[PDB]
C-alpha cells in the first residue's frame, strides 16, 4: 500500500481542535494506548492517535469500547475509523476528545508502523 500517509485524514486532529468540527469521520492511526487511573468504575483508555500530520494524546475510548481493547484488535499501530465521537471540555480548559463509535480499518498487524512523521499538536 505505497503512499502510507495517504490512507490517514491529514488535518483532522486540527480540524477536530480548532473547529470542533463534529460531522467529519476522520480516519485515525492508534499510536498507543493506556489505561487512566480510575477508582471502582470500568477502565478508561486514553490513547494517542495520528492524522499523519498531527499526534494527539487528548482521546478517550467510550467505556461500551473497552471490548475493542481487552478483547479485540485497537491496539498499537492499527488504523480507525472514527464514527462518532464528542469533544468535552474540562473546567482547566483542557479539551477531551471521547470516541464512541470507531471501525478498525486495518489490524495493527496488517500496518505494523507509525505512519509517517506526525508531530504533537499544541493545546
Ligand atoms: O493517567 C493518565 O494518563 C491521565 C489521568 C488523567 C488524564 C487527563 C486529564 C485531562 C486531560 F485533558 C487529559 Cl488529555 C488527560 O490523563
Ligand atoms: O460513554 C462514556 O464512557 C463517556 C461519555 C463522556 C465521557 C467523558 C467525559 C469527560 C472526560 F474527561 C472523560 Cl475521560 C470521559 O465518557
Same mark, same amino acid.
Given at each position: 500500500?505505497?503512499?502510507?500517509?495517504?490512507?490517514?485524514?491529514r488535518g483532522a486532529i486540527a480540524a477536530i481542535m480548532q473547529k470542533?468540527?463534529?460531522?467529519?469521520?476522520?480516519?485515525l492511526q492508534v499510536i498507543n494506548i493506556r489505561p487512566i487511573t480510575t477508582?471502582?468504575?470500568?477502565?478508561?483508555? /486514553?490513547?494517542?492517535?495520528?492524522?499523519? +500530520?498531527?499526534? !494527539?494524546? &487528548?482521546?478517550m475510548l467510550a467505556t461500551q469500547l473497552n471490548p475493542l481493547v481487552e478483547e479485540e484488535q485497537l491496539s498499537?499501530?492499527?488504523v480507525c475509523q472514527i464514527h462518532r465521537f464528542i469533544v468535552n471540555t474540562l473546567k482547566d480548559g483542557? /479539551?477531551?476528545?471521547?470516541?464512541?463509535? +470507531?471501525?478498525? !480499518?486495518? &489490524?495493527?498487524?496488517?500496518?505494523?508502523?507509525?505512519?509517517?512523521?506526525?508531530?504533537?499538536?499544541?493545546?
Amino acid at each position: 500500500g505505497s503512499h502510507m500517509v495517504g490512507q490517514l485524514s491529514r488535518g483532522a486532529i486540527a480540524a477536530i481542535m480548532q473547529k470542533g468540527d463534529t460531522n467529519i469521520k476522520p480516519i485515525l492511526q492508534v499510536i498507543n494506548i493506556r489505561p487512566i487511573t480510575t477508582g471502582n468504575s470500568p477502565p478508561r483508555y /486514553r490513547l494517542l492517535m495520528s492524522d499523519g +500530520l498531527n499526534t !494527539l494524546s &487528548s482521546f478517550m475510548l467510550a467505556t461500551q469500547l473497552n471490548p475493542l481493547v481487552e478483547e479485540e484488535q485497537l491496539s498499537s499501530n492499527c488504523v480507525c475509523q472514527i464514527h462518532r465521537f464528542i469533544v468535552n471540555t474540562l473546567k482547566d480548559g483542557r /479539551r477531551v476528545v471521547i470516541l464512541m463509535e +470507531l471501525e478498525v !480499518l486495518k &489490524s495493527a498487524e496488517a500496518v505494523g508502523v507509525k505512519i509517517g512523521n506526525p508531530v504533537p499538536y499544541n493545546e
